[PDB]
Design a protein around this ligand. Sequence first.
Ligand SMILES: *[C@@H]1O[C@H](CO)[C@@H](O[C@@H]2O[C@H](CO)[C@@H](O[C@@H]3O[C@H](CO[C@H]4O[C@H](CO)[C@@H](O)[C@H](O)[C@@H]4O)[C@@H](O)[C@H](O[C@H]4O[C@H](CO)[C@@H](O)[C@H](O)[C@@H]4O)[C@@H]3O)[C@H](O)[C@H]2NC(C)=O)[C@H](O)[C@H]1NC(C)=O
Ligand SMILES: *[C@@H]1O[C@H](CO)[C@@H](O[C@@H]2O[C@H](CO)[C@@H](O[C@@H]3O[C@H](CO[C@H]4O[C@H](CO)[C@@H](O)[C@H](O)[C@@H]4O)[C@@H](O)[C@H](O[C@H]4O[C@H](CO)[C@@H](O)[C@H](O)[C@@H]4O)[C@@H]3O)[C@H](O)[C@H]2NC(C)=O)[C@H](O)[C@H]1NC(C)=O
Ligand SMILES: *[C@@H]1O[C@H](CO)[C@@H](O[C@@H]2O[C@H](CO)[C@@H](O[C@@H]3O[C@H](CO[C@H]4O[C@H](CO)[C@@H](O)[C@H](O)[C@@H]4O)[C@@H](O)[C@H](O[C@H]4O[C@H](CO)[C@@H](O)[C@H](O)[C@@H]4O)[C@@H]3O)[C@H](O)[C@H]2NC(C)=O)[C@H](O)[C@H]1NC(C)=O
Ligand SMILES: *[C@@H]1O[C@H](CO)[C@@H](O[C@@H]2O[C@H](CO)[C@@H](O[C@@H]3O[C@H](CO[C@H]4O[C@H](CO)[C@@H](O)[C@H](O)[C@@H]4O)[C@@H](O)[C@H](O[C@H]4O[C@H](CO)[C@@H](O)[C@H](O)[C@@H]4O)[C@@H]3O)[C@H](O)[C@H]2NC(C)=O)[C@H](O)[C@H]1NC(C)=O
Ligand SMILES: CCCCCCCC/C=C/CCCCCCCC(=O)O[C@@H](COC(=O)CCCCCCCCCCCCCCC)COP(=O)([O-])OCC[N+](C)(C)C
Ligand SMILES: CC(C)CCC[C@@H](C)[C@H]1CC[C@H]2[C@@H]3CC=C4C[C@@H](O)CC[C@]4(C)[C@H]3CC[C@]12C
Ligand SMILES: CC(C)CCC[C@@H](C)[C@H]1CC[C@H]2[C@@H]3CC=C4C[C@@H](O)CC[C@]4(C)[C@H]3CC[C@]12C
Ligand SMILES: CC(C)CCC[C@@H](C)[C@H]1CC[C@H]2[C@@H]3CC=C4C[C@@H](O)CC[C@]4(C)[C@H]3CC[C@]12C
Ligand SMILES: CC(C)CCC[C@@H](C)[C@H]1CC[C@H]2[C@@H]3CC=C4C[C@@H](O)CC[C@]4(C)[C@H]3CC[C@]12C
Lengths: 186, 49, 51, 156, 103, 266, 197
Amino acid sequence: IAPCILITLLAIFVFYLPPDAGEKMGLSIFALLTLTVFLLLLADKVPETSLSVPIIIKYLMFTMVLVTFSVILSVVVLNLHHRSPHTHQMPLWVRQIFIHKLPLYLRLKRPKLPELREVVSSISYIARQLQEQEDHDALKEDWQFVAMVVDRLFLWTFIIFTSVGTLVIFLDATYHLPPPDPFPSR
Amino acid sequence: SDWVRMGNALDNICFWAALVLFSVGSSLIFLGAYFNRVPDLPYAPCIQP
Amino acid sequence: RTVDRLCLFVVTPVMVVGTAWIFLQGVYNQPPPQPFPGDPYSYNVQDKRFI
Amino acid sequence: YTENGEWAIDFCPGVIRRHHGGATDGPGETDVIYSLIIRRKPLFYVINIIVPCVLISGLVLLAYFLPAQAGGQKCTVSINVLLAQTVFLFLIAQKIPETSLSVPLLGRFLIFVMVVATLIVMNCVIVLNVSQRTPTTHAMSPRLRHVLLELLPRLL
Amino acid sequence: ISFMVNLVFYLPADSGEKTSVAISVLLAQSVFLLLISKRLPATSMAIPLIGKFLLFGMVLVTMVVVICVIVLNIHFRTPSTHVLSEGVKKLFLETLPELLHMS
Amino acid sequence: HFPFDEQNCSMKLGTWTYDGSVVAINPESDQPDLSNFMESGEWVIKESRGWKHSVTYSCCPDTPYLDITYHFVMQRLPLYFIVNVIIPCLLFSFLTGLVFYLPTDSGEKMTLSISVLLSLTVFLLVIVELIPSTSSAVPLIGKYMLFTMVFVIASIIITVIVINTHHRSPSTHVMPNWVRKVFIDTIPNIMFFSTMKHPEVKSAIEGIKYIAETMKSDQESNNAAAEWKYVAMVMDHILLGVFMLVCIIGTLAVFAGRLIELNQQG
Amino acid sequence: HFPFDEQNCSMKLGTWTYDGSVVAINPESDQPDLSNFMESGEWVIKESRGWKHSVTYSCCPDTPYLDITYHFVMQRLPLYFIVNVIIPCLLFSFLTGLVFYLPTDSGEKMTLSISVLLSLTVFLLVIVELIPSTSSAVPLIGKYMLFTMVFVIASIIITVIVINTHHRSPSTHVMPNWVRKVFIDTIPNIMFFSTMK
Ligand SMILES: *[C@@H]1O[C@H](CO)[C@@H](O[C@@H]2O[C@H](CO)[C@@H](O[C@@H]3O[C@H](CO[C@H]4O[C@H](CO)[C@@H](O)[C@H](O)[C@@H]4O)[C@@H](O)[C@H](O[C@H]4O[C@H](CO)[C@@H](O)[C@H](O)[C@@H]4O)[C@@H]3O)[C@H](O)[C@H]2NC(C)=O)[C@H](O)[C@H]1NC(C)=O
Ligand SMILES: *[C@@H]1O[C@H](CO)[C@@H](O[C@@H]2O[C@H](CO)[C@@H](O[C@@H]3O[C@H](CO[C@H]4O[C@H](CO)[C@@H](O)[C@H](O)[C@@H]4O)[C@@H](O)[C@H](O[C@H]4O[C@H](CO)[C@@H](O)[C@H](O)[C@@H]4O)[C@@H]3O)[C@H](O)[C@H]2NC(C)=O)[C@H](O)[C@H]1NC(C)=O
Ligand SMILES: *[C@@H]1O[C@H](CO)[C@@H](O[C@@H]2O[C@H](CO)[C@@H](O[C@@H]3O[C@H](CO[C@H]4O[C@H](CO)[C@@H](O)[C@H](O)[C@@H]4O)[C@@H](O)[C@H](O[C@H]4O[C@H](CO)[C@@H](O)[C@H](O)[C@@H]4O)[C@@H]3O)[C@H](O)[C@H]2NC(C)=O)[C@H](O)[C@H]1NC(C)=O
Ligand SMILES: *[C@@H]1O[C@H](CO)[C@@H](O[C@@H]2O[C@H](CO)[C@@H](O[C@@H]3O[C@H](CO[C@H]4O[C@H](CO)[C@@H](O)[C@H](O)[C@@H]4O)[C@@H](O)[C@H](O[C@H]4O[C@H](CO)[C@@H](O)[C@H](O)[C@@H]4O)[C@@H]3O)[C@H](O)[C@H]2NC(C)=O)[C@H](O)[C@H]1NC(C)=O
Ligand SMILES: CCCCCCCC/C=C/CCCCCCCC(=O)O[C@@H](COC(=O)CCCCCCCCCCCCCCC)COP(=O)([O-])OCC[N+](C)(C)C
Ligand SMILES: CC(C)CCC[C@@H](C)[C@H]1CC[C@H]2[C@@H]3CC=C4C[C@@H](O)CC[C@]4(C)[C@H]3CC[C@]12C
Ligand SMILES: CC(C)CCC[C@@H](C)[C@H]1CC[C@H]2[C@@H]3CC=C4C[C@@H](O)CC[C@]4(C)[C@H]3CC[C@]12C
Ligand SMILES: CC(C)CCC[C@@H](C)[C@H]1CC[C@H]2[C@@H]3CC=C4C[C@@H](O)CC[C@]4(C)[C@H]3CC[C@]12C
Ligand SMILES: CC(C)CCC[C@@H](C)[C@H]1CC[C@H]2[C@@H]3CC=C4C[C@@H](O)CC[C@]4(C)[C@H]3CC[C@]12C
């Protein structure tokens, strides 16, 4: 139980890892691998019958599904982050929802004479290239900000979904007490 | 870029070397089994077909 | 980098001290000098209790 | 007769032997020996162990096609194939016999692919070392340049 | 292997191999836990000493992974996504480095 | 059909040393007595029945040999194997196709793919620990596991091809016409995505000109590389769709036959 | 010396309730009869010999106690442990040193070293299921595995130090004179010198 809780905490903390570090996938998928090792651990202990599923098995599969969804949504965030600005045009609804509406609600504050003729041509070309670079960087920053907002949304969603599921399973296990009477009336 | 091209050439020749090694060794190891059939003995089968 | 250095000097001593305490509980674990607490007799061949 | 799930009985001759009939041996002895010649049906090992092991061990050849840069993950692939081979070693240790008269084919194949993977890991390390040389640390060796870039394509 | 997790603090954030090291240490600890689980009975009278160390090490390695995530998050901030206040600059670039005898 | 398998298992009973002419055996009832049968958590007995058989040989026409064979038709309860085997395999198979949505510039494609393979390999230990190991036939679990393994291997190989295409240098490699026509012209038509007078003065003049030409050449090289990146991005989209389709259809083609058979037969 | 160990086990035989003054025992032959001995796939019997022994105690000088002890000198066949245990350890030991030829800019040094460590950790399952779980002495395989584990760990430590040194910049550190003199001046003079200063 305790290693599963720790793995779940790390799966939550994946979403705080910046995309530029190039480390989300390794963390999430090695968490999945550790859960696989723990499934191997439980194989020698759990009963073999098929009338019902043990609650510890339910918790293990819930954790596996949580880590799988963390992997999937980390892939989504990385796809948004590394999106090439010139091959993608950001739709206007994406701009609205993920740059104007959601960031306020998630508390994400975005801050804010041959020689002379050849000289003029070269300088103007360099300035135009740098202006194009600036526009490209602005679109790239817009995509990266969308990725960051989506990452924060997924972080909060995972906190809520982990808390609710863990509380439900743990309270179901905790309040399963033995019978007060050896022969209860049914 | 010259260094990268040198590395690419090394990786190209070494691919074929490794492929030949892997294929030949695996083929020999499994052909050892392919020639390990039950010998043709001078007896009838234990179970009639 | 500063946060990393502070976390090094905070986390490594905790790990070392916790490991040392946990394993020192076991290193100095020996059975009692007598087989039965409260009984001073050693139940050894040397210390025969002649009638 | 229902055939064993793993073993097929091909032959089963019987022989009546007599020995120790000599004067020095004394009273003669006899017995009956039946020789069950049984063939294993290897389907379980083929589906569960050998085919996955062969594919995972063939994956190291893909490392030769990845770029020799920071984001290539050429060493990632090779060494993780070695790790998977170690997992397969643990798997195979539960099945093989534990005698030392000869090495079983499964173990021989696993050790061979592990050696090949180690050699490919060394090869990838060398290729990376050659590829990411910069003038700030290394001087351009002309012998290797001529051997690889000029002589090799013309020889090929 | 458990003590090996402490080297991540000395790894630079530009290497991009910090959380990988820490989570791999966690995986190795899980393998050791699997090894120990076969060798003792599942009694509740006490936690074994080796079990106590393994739980303590797993918790510490998890905390180290969280710390590495936070350190990388701080490292990869830029003016276009975060604002670097003067208080943070004063605290983390002048006072703490000289307290800690950093270069 | 394991774990959805049905097993007919018999128990032949007879007098070992007495023949039917001195000792006759008859079943007490047409079925075995299951009144005091304890419920099984792994099997359900659909049918049970006891048949008497008499066999006479031409050598001994006056001495028949009698037996009573009780047979039980048993159906396995598959919930344990569904929960512990099939669901993790389904999760790994679903994760296999996600690499084709992961950009190459992330530098984590091989991390994801190879680590999914490692997780599947570690889960193979669980597979061997749980299901029985026999060579009479390939179980349904075995077929699904092998399908997942081949799926992961194919994903790794195609991912390596995609990465190689992404990193094609425009100097060493030149674009074939067929690649341009297939991937830049034809395929994107069906893609509904966001896709697409002192010496020193003269030296200074030549320096500014050289800088301008250097930026120009860099721009052309970057555009040529971006064409390859676009090509690899088109292959990634198609491969994501194809692999998600193959996952679903492989799962169905593996299980739905036996599932439909059991549903139709109650 | 496991798995190259030689073991001398015996079988002590004697009359439980009869002393030598009522029942006398003598071996049939100097050596055990091995004519019908089935071949062993794990051990070879180098030597075998049966010895009679007589013990007399001062309490009862006239009642000797007899036994016949057959001893067998047995040499282990080590091919199984060579193939399954030693060779993978040798491969991991060889892979340990290859990280120091990897460039730091590859960003794969930690991947290689940590994956070798993980392979050794997984291999510990094989070794502990194979190695004798006794504390009389350290088996030789155990010594070799501890060697490999300790030195891959040392390689990981030193690789972290090397990466840290590689990533240094004047904005964080200043090169001391002794580091420059030791590493840039003296050592390259006694090296291949293909790498320019
Ligand atoms: C651990 O396991 C044991 C064994 O499985 C359980 O013991 C059973 O407990 C139940 C509930 O207490 C018992 O069921 C009750 O039996 C009473 C007596 O029945 C006997 O006597 C009558 C005649 O008087 C016979 O007809 C009958 O065949 C028996 O021989 C009944 O009087 C009870 O009925 C009353 O309660 C039920 C439920 O509320 C109502 O529906 C009825 O209308 C009526 O009011 C009832 O049937 C059962 O017999 C026990 N089995 C035994 C003793 O072998 C333990 O309960 C279980 N412990 C747990 C789970 O904590
Ligand atoms: C390994 O395991 C064995 C048990 O398997 C332990 O042996 C036990 O040791 C304890 C302590 O030495 C014994 O407990 C003592 O029993 C004495 C006799 O009690 C009997 O007689 C009285 C009447 O005279 C009856 O009432 C009673 O029911 C018994 O039949 C007591 O006199 C001792 O009193 C001590 O404890 C009390 C309470 O704390 C004090 O007030 C006294 O002053 C005094 O200190 C005591 O209770 C126990 O009987 C042993 N079990 C056996 C022999 O089976 C070994 O100690 C243990 N070894 C180690 C190293 O752990
Ligand atoms: C699992 O495996 C068991 C075998 O281990 C199968 O059991 C068989 O079940 C069928 C019925 O479904 C049995 O067939 C019936 O046998 C009866 C007795 O036959 C014996 O006695 C007669 C005496 O005259 C001999 O002639 C005969 O050789 C046998 O020694 C017959 O009386 C039944 O006849 C009925 O069917 C026939 C057509 O088949 C009609 O013409 C008749 O009028 C009548 O309706 C019938 O033949 C069979 O003998 C069983 N075998 C054994 C070895 O027990 C299970 O069916 C199988 N379960 C599955 C797969 O679902
Ligand atoms: C594995 O372990 C076993 C048991 O420890 C070893 O067996 C011992 O082997 C040695 C030989 O190396 C034996 O020693 C020999 O015993 C003989 C016994 O003779 C009988 O008669 C005398 C009276 O004359 C009695 O006292 C005795 O009990 C017997 O009834 C001796 O005759 C041998 O003599 C040799 O040594 C003497 C010097 O001591 C010389 O003068 C002789 O010429 C001759 O060389 C000898 O002493 C010993 O008895 C065995 N012990 C047991 C318990 O069986 C194995 O050797 C060992 N295997 C290894 C490690 O290889
Ligand atoms: C051992 C574990 C704790 C280690 C802490 C080490 C700290 C070292 C020192 C850090 C110094 C940082 C200085 C620069 C920033 C100053 C301003 C500031 O605080 O805001 C910045 C945060 O900066 C932080 O680091 C906030 C603290 C950590 C947040 C992560 C969750 C809580 C801790 C881990 C969980 C503990 C319990 C579970 C694990 C046991 C900017 O914040 P934001 O990104 O705009 O919004 C974050 C919102 N969120 C938190 C919802 C995502
Ligand atoms: C946690 C979620 C997200 C993923 C894992 C799903 C698990 C918990 C599901 C899959 C199959 C399910 C079981 C299917 C059928 C039965 C039989 C009956 O007694 C109701 C509960 C029980 C025993 C279910 C319990 C929950 C279960 C085990
Ligand atoms: C794997 C590659 C690299 C090398 C292959 C080398 C070949 C020649 C080796 C590998 C395994 C070897 C076999 C292993 C064991 C035996 C049993 C023994 O009683 C006779 C020799 C025999 C049958 C060997 C013959 C030679 C052999 C087939
Ligand atoms: C390292 C690579 C090249 C080879 C990997 C396979 C290894 C395990 C193979 C290669 C050659 C093989 C040996 C070849 C021949 C013999 C003689 C035979 O009487 C017993 C087995 C023995 C001693 C083999 C043992 C296994 C062996 C050592
Ligand atoms: C950090 C790197 C360099 C690895 C260091 C390994 C050291 C700490 C290890 C390797 C071998 C170990 C020794 C191996 C065996 C024994 C005998 C026994 O009495 C326990 C302690 C003792 C004496 C160990 C002490 C710790 C030890 C010396």
